[PDB]
């Protein structure tokens, strides 16, 4: 019926960092008769989801081979 | 009935430091024929009160002034 209180989490991250490559898929979420704070909480959730997804990508593509046989000549 | 002896507190701080702030607040001191020593400790008390006010109002500004997000791109 209820949940834990929300964190402090002050500020909006798209207004401070609008030059990160996650912004187009981040801006896909828009409100359909949702209020301001509810959409902002869903926006914070949709931003941490894309940040987590891209950080999992940046973990995956370096741990395929952390060395490489091909960079020995390089 | 009475009180403790006063501390030493030699000299007058407002005279030796004219380039400091909070002396425009320290100008208006309501002396109505106050004696040559009673106004001295009244100057002491009001000066340390203004100094403590300035130190608290700069401490709360240094507390609310955290490493910001607009100071991260800076």
Curated annotation (Swiss-Prot), chains A, B:
It comes from the Viruses. It is found in: Virion; Host nucleus. Belongs to the herpesviridae small capsomere-interacting protein family. Interacts with the major capsid protein/MCP. Participates in the assembly of the infectious particles by decorating the outer surface of the capsid shell and thus forming a layer between the capsid and the tegument. Complexes composed of the major capsid protein and small capsomere-interacting protein/SCP assemble together in the host cytoplasm and are translocated to the nucleus, where they accumulate and participate in capsid assembly. This is Small capsomere-interacting protein. It comes from Epstein-Barr virus (strain B95-8). The chain holds residues 2 to 75 of 176 of the full protein.
